[PDB]
UniProtKB/Swiss-Prot annotation, chains A, B:
Residues of the full protein shown: 64 to 346 of 354
UniProt-annotated binding residues for Mn(2+): D154, D156
Note on how the cofactor is bound: Binds 1 Mn(2+) ion per subunit.
Binding residues for an alpha-L-fucosyl-(1->2)-beta-D-galactosyl derivative: H176, T188, E246, D269
Role description: This protein is the basis of the ABO blood group system. The histo-blood group ABO involves three carbohydrate antigens: A, B, and H. A, B, and AB individuals express a glycosyltransferase activity that converts the H antigen to the A antigen (by addition of UDP-GalNAc) or to the B antigen (by addition of UDP-Gal), whereas O individuals lack such activity.
Protein localization: Golgi apparatus, Golgi stack membrane; Secreted
Sugar-bearing residue positions: N56
Protein species of origin: Homo sapiens
Pathway noted in the entry: Protein modification; protein glycosylation
Gene: ABO
Name of the molecule in the record: Histo-blood group ABO system transferase
Amino acid sequence: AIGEFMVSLPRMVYPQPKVLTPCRKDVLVVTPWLAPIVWEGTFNIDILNEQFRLQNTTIGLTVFAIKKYVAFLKLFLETAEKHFMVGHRVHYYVFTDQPAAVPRVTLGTGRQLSVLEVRAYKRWQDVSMRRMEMISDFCERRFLSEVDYLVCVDVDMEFRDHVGVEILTPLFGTLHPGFYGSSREAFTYERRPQSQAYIPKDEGDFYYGGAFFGGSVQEVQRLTRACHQAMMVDQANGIEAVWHDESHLNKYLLRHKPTKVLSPEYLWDQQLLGWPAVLRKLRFTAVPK
Amino acid sequence: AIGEFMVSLPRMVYPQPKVLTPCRKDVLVVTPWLAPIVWEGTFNIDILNEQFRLQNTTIGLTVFAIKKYVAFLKLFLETAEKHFMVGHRVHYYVFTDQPAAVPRVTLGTGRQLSVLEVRAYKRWQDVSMRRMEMISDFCERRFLSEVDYLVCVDVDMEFRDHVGVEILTPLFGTLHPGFYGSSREAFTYERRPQSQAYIPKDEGDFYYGGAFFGGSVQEVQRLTRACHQAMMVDQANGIEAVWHDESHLNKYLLRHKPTKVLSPEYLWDQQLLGWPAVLRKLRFTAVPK
Ligand SMILES: CCCCCCCCO[C@@H]1O[C@H](CO)[C@H](O)[C@H](O)[C@H]1O[C@@H]1O[C@@H](C)[C@@H](O)[C@@H](O)[C@@H]1O
Ligand SMILES: CCCCCCCCO[C@@H]1O[C@H](CO)[C@H](O)[C@H](O)[C@H]1O[C@@H]1O[C@@H](C)[C@@H](O)[C@@H](O)[C@@H]1O
Ligand SMILES: [Mn+2]
Ligand SMILES: [Mn+2]
């Protein structure tokens, strides 16, 4: 459940927070609209686990495995079993054009998987973009009745460390690993005013990655519907945004500020970018080709 | 309104947040349960004003002026007019045993004041403690229909700088100015196990001040009802907590973590404590005697 009467926390013994010591001296840990930016060292997972377990939280995880991408499912799901929301109720939703190609992965107690058959588009760009329509449609069909939060991710990835309830909030985006240190002028936002995803050179907070976003079912429905409708307007106007669904996600999150932002710990590519000092953990990473 | 469909923010030009620069290097700006700790330098007030104005936010401010404390109302209200939630809808609620002693203070547009007549208790301790019962009772009578958030403060104070929508959240407490740098063992929590306010030496996050707390009407109702019921149990058991309502507030906020914590900028005494380097602004301060 979300936003329902909360019982008291039990007695807990943990180190006292230190008012006169910053939790990080090397990174920004709160946005200018007072949303936490989630880095290792900012949170006590024991306190957060208590808070979310007492609310009997269920987390949905959506993933698309269309055409050749079914090959990524086995590693994705097996590593999710090790690292994603362990101890909490989880419902995996696998969107695929090939239900028979979904691997039989052994799941821990309180965790389930549903296969949702969808159509395959020819262009990889359309497969990617149409995730917004499909997620929005299923928010109405299944998600509202089955989960409290939705986490929407790319499939060609693996979990390598803890991804837990610290991410949960009404609306979150994730700092794209290629651009977290970049100035806004260098962000690869859509720059053509003819597109619904247009962002001028003097606007923008962060460059969010299309590969990892989420929130409450209500807020994810709103985001995905808005991005789908914007893409349809663009299509009618004969324009396709430079980075497809990610361009629209960035426009939406500029105009509707997320209530948490995840650090690049949560979306990384070690082959391309190595392992910088600012990342104490690499949690969710690209599978190398 | 709270938690209702939110329109898009307009185009805004402001400095880009800096991912690789901490907003403060001298203080903790987020709790271990990912609640912002509100200090100057953590927030862009222009973004926050937009977010809250678009929701047509109304803020209630409660203050008790019983017996001789009516003398503090003129300065309290005149300085609130200069500094508290300017630009937003405000409803002042003055609880008093002397309706005729309430000064005629000139209010800005969209701001109103109601006088609520209540009984006076003989002991200053009971006057202070019974605020919990009275606030809870009025949450049901007026507050649910009239305001979105409630801010509950001591009257023998004055505003000296901005106190705005940066504080608003479902539940907040404020770091007591006497103890923000203290270890938990030194906190003046209630230490007798016979009291409902009991906190052991190895528990506690912060020492919150009884003089400044608030949140959504729903969360304030819960807090004030819980503290009142706990005080009644103590009374039946022949025990009175060491710091009265503040002791119970601290027990409640230990077991129900606030969603924002205000720095001592928001609750200060310059005569007693001066003006430390960590305070860039002194916002709400004790009136000297
Ligand atoms: C600061 C110097 C500029 C250097 C920036 C290097 C990162 C580029 O990143 C790409 O960024 C694009 C947006 O501009 C899209 O998000 C694309 O999906 C992404 O590539 C994806 O994510 C990457 C991390 C890799 O895993 C790549 O194989 C993926 O296709
Ligand atoms: C670290 C060295 C220890 C030194 C600590 C000095 C601050 C003491 O503070 C008192 O703390 C009490 C709880 O323990 C109550 O909250 C009391 O209301 C408060 O006095 C109030 O607030 C004060 C700031 C003053 O304005 C005082 O006049 C008020 O009555
Ligand atoms: Mn990919
Ligand atoms: Mn006082």
